[PDB]
Subunit: 112 residues, 4 copies
Amino acid sequence: GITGTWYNQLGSTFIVTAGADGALTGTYEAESRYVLTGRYDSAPATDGSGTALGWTVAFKNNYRNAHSATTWSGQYVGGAEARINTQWLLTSGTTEANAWKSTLVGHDTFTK
Amino acid sequence: GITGTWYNQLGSTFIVTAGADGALTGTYESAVGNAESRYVLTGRYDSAPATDGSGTALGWTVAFKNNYRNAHSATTWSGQYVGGAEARINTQWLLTSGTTEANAWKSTLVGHDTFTKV
Amino acid sequence: GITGTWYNQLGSTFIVTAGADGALTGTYESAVGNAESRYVLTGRYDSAPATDGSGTALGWTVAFKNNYRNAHSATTWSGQYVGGAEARINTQWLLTSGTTEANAWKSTLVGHDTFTK
Amino acid sequence: GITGTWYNQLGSTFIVTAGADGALTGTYEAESRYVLTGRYDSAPATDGSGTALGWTVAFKNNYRNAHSATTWSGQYVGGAEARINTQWLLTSGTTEANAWKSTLVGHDTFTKV
């Protein structure tokens, strides 16, 4: 149930395809569209546990470059209403003097 | 630059190819935890970084499933590449395990990794 | 405002008083009632927040050790108070457990809690 | 052992006094001095385990206000070269429109040297 169009809390849209080998590929939202790549556990447990996954987006496309990248780590939860629960790290490229403030942390919840 | 073999402070091995689309591909082998042999990684990087001395932002994911064993978990590394006589990849990571809704609050570990050439 | 009784998404109880000097003191309730699961908290907040609608920055710590149990672990919450009337406290936390040097890479959990008054 | 003057890799002086009832009090460094308050495990294991700790500093004093606070979470590793390893979270006050980018994360290592 991972393959699909997902939306987070701020109307961002993630279109993902989950290959049977464990690959995740797709798009993050024209000038605002970006490539995404990740991996997921293609053989989760069955004690009712979520499926672990993750992905990465570099905020560079042919229209802009913000010099940074975000990784989302979390799990897909199946049920009457499917969701993906994640936490994320965004890192910006900095000078070494500035490295201490290069990384933001947050959380996102996605729904179809 | 980024392409090559790196080692973190625990001895884990990171073998990467940085392509010109900004794709990261390679394998990861962990010196710790419930992992054995190599795992597939996939990632992205800024392939047109600032020319100002700023590091190179990157990120990647490893799901710890291979033919040897499955830890039902995935890790992401977010950080930057700093070139030079002692080139480095400084990262922070999130490790999420599959849990039941009830146990979710203890699903995610956080830490930092430093990768160097030896 | 910040002073009062709050609870997070899992029903845990936080009893906090904000001091005139930016001090935060109070108690963490794991169960509603049980005293064996009652823990001392302490923190700091911004006693003079910006006037443009920004929240109020805050932080606090709970070490999981009282008269009855010692988990050998400690949690810190970082986040902000947002008043108005819905009034919410939004945080991120870090829980560390004492470990050997060899297992330090698995000593800290991370998450987010939201509080209701 | 915990009580003392600690320095991080970036300079900053933290002065902490450890209390027998698990409390932590001190200052982060006069217009750049701030109150720090925290807790720790005053009965740690002797199996080689580190002592769990946490503290908070809100960056307002009688001179300045940055509208931000930081929490540190980690453990004291005593022994030959006493050290405190930590992960930290800094939050600033934001509108809740800028809320997704209100919180920075990093790690700090402290020595008495």
